[PDB]
């Protein structure tokens, strides 16, 4: 019967590895939350980047021609040298 007791004692030998697995499973289930975080960061930090990187980050969809008709810097609406 000590044999039975040995197994019943040993069934919990690897507690540290089981608790690590549980927390990894939690971390796995949080990974999908990146799909909303990373874009939201770039959305807020877009204006910090330079014009050249703004274009790459958007795959060319944004460029200087896409700056508003009334750009926040009035002297640079329609380009760095103005409209004409």
């Amino acid at each position: 019967t000590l044999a039975v007791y040995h197994r019943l004692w040993g069934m919990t030998e690897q507690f540290a590895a089981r608790k690590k697995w549980g927390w990894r499973q939690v971390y796995h289930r949080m990974l999908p939350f990146q799909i909303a975080l990373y874009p939201s960061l770039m959305w807020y930090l877009f204006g910090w980047f330079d014009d050249p990187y703004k274009e790459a980050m958007t795959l060319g969809i944004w460029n200087v021609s896409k700056r508003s008709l009334y750009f926040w810097d009035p002297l640079r609406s329609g380009g760095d040298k103005g409209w004409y």
Binding site: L2, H6, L8, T12, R18
Partner: protein
């Protein structure tokens, strides 16, 4: 038959010394933790239940059940029937009920029931009950007027474990002071469970009136007043030494 005990013949099972290393090989396999795993999609996910899926089943082997009787060298009698069911019912009966209590020992039989499946020499209370649970076993202990029974209902595959756990209640029980004190709660619950069943309550009244302050009359449940004075691990152990034995 090698031994006749109280009118019945038993086959004597001899004690043998085996290494823990060799018996471990025969213990049923089970895990408490599942740390990773091998993914495998449910193959029958698209198979309706009306379509049989099992093929090449071994032919059944049916045997007429017969009751077989054996006895260990310590004097413990073993009686078993196999109806070839898939769930087993293991029970340990001890010839120590309320009728054997002296007036100063009132309620001690019930107290033994209350401390059942607590810490043993080689297993803590929590580990005993969590094992019985993870293996899907149900059971408990009931103290009567003539006997006390420890029963466990289990899937037959896990009998090696269940037998050990049941026997440990009578072989090397650690009646630790603070674990026994935690069992005082069960007395009030027992009284409520008895009084709820009106037929059984009226039966308890009958026996107490029929046999006045003697064997069968002796109350089946301990009271929660003056009886708690000797609701102690030491007192329980002395009671067990008097009545609990392999021969009974």
């Amino acid at each position: 038959g090698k031994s006749t005990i109280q009118g019945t013949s038993y086959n004597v099972v001899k004690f043998q010394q085996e290494d823990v290393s060799e018996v471990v090989k025969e213990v049923p396999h089970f895990q408490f933790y599942y740390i990773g795993g091998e993914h495998k999609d449910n193959k029958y996910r698209d198979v309706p239940l009306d379509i049989p899926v099992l093929t090449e089943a071994p032919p059944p082997q049916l045997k007429k059940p017969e009751m077989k009787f054996s006895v260990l060298e310590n004097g413990m009698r073993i009686v078993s029937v196999d109806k070839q069911g898939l769930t087993s019912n293991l029970g340990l009966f001890v010839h120590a009920g309320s009728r054997f209590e002296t007036p100063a020992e009132e309620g001690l039989s019930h107290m033994v029931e209350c401390v059942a499946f607590r810490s043993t020499a080689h297993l803590s209370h929590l580990r005993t009950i969590k094992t019985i649970e993870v293996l899907g076993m149900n059971g408990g202990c009931q103290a009567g007027r003539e006997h006390i029974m420890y029963n466990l209902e289990l899937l037959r595959e896990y009998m090696p474990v269940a037998s050990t756990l049941v026997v440990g209640n009578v072989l090397f029980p650690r009646l630790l002071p603070w674990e026994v004190n935690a069992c005082h709660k069960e007395i009030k619950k027992a009284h409520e469970r008895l009084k709820a069943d009106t037929d059984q309550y009226v039966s308890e009244l009958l026996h107490q009136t029929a046999y006045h302050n003697n064997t069968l009359g002796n109350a089946l449940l301990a009271n929660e007043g003056r009886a708690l004075e000797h609701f102690t691990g030491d007192n329980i152990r002395e009671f067990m030494m008097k009545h609990f034995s392999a021969e009974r």
